Amino acid sequence: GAMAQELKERAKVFAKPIGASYQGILDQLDLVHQAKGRDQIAASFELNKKINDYIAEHPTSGRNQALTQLKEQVTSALFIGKMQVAQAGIDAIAQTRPELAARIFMVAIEEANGKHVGLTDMMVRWANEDPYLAPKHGYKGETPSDLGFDAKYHVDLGEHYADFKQWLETSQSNGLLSKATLDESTKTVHLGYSYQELQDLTGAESVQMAFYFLKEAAKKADPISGDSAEMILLKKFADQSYLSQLDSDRMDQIEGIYRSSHETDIDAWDRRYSGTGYDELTNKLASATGVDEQLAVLLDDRKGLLIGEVHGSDVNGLRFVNEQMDALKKQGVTVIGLEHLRSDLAQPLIDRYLATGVMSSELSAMLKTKHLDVTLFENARANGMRIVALDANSSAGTEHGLMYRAGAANNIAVEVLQNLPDGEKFVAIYGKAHLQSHKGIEGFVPGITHRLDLPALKVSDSNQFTVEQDDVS
Instruction: State the DSSP string of 103-144.
Output: HHHHHHHHHHTTSSTTHHHHHHHHHHH-GGGS----B-S---
Phi, psi (rounded to 5 degrees) for 152: -100, -25
Structure determined via: X-ray
Cβ–Cβ under 8 Å, residues 359 and 365: no
Q: Which residue type, as a one-letter code, is found at position 318?
A: L
Contact 95, 83 (CB under 8 A): no
Instruction: Give the count of alpha carbons within 13 A of 229, CB side only.
Output: 16
Fold type of domain 247-468: Rossmann fold (3.40.50)
Same fold, 6-133 and 247-468: no
Q: Name the amino acid, one letter, at 52.
A: N
CB neighbours of 127 closer than 8 A, spacing ≥ 6?
A: 93, 97, 100, 104, 133
For Cα atoms 191, 152, 211, give the angle at the middle one, nearest 5 degrees. Answer: 45
* Contact between residue 298 and residue 466 where contact means Cβ atoms under 8 Å apart: no
CA-to-CA dists, residue 20 to 48, 50, 125, angstroms = 17, 12, 36
**Distance between CA atoms of 235 and 224, rounded to whole angstroms?**
14
If you compute the radius of gyration of the chain from its CA atoms, what whole number of angstroms results? 27
Resolution (A): 2.7
- What one-character DSSP code corresponds to residue 429? E
Sign for the pseudo-dihedral over CA of 397, 400, 402, 404: negative
CATH topology of domain 6-133: Butyryl-CoA Dehydrogenase, subunit A; domain 3 (1.20.140)
* Strands 443-445, 438-440: pairing kind: antiparallel
How would you classify the pairing of strands 425-431 and 456-459? Answer: unpaired
Given a contact cutoff of 8 angstroms between Cβ atoms, the answer to whether 304 and 454 are in contact is yes
Q: How far apart are CA 369 and CA 235, in angstroms?
A: 28
How wide is the angle at C-alpha 322 spanned by C-alphas 316 and 328, nearest 5°?
A: 100
Burial of 453 (0-12, 13-18, 19+ CB in 10 A): middle
Q: Find the farthest-apart pair of alpha carbons in the chain and give their distance in angstroms, rounded.
A: 109
Name which of 378, 385, 388 is nearest 340 in CA terms. 388
* Positive or negative torsion for Cα 175, 180, 181, 182: negative
Helix (H/G/I), strand (E/B), else coil: 421: coil
φ/ψ (deg, to 5) at 424? -90, 125
| Domain parsing of the chain, residue ranges | 6-133, 247-468
d(CA 199, CA 230): 11
Backbone angles phi, psi at 57, to 5 degrees: -75, -30
CA dist 334 and 387 (Å) reads 9
Residue 141, sorted as left (phi over 0), alpha (psi -120 to 50) or beta, turns out to be left
The Cα 243–Cα 138 span in angstroms is 8
| Own/partner pairs, 106-112, CB within 8 angstroms, 24+ separation | 106/38, 106/41, 107/255, 108/83, 109/83, 111/86, 112/81, 112/82, 112/83, 112/85
List helix spans (H) across 264-373.
266-273, 276-287, 291-298, 316-323, 325-331, 343-356, 361-369
Distance separating the N- and C-terminal Cα atoms of the chain: 85
Which residue in 217, 218, 221, 214 sits closest to 199, CA to CA? 214
* Pairing relationship of beta strands 425-431 and 333-342 according to DSSP bridges: parallel
From CA 408, how far away is CA 402, in angstroms rounded?
10
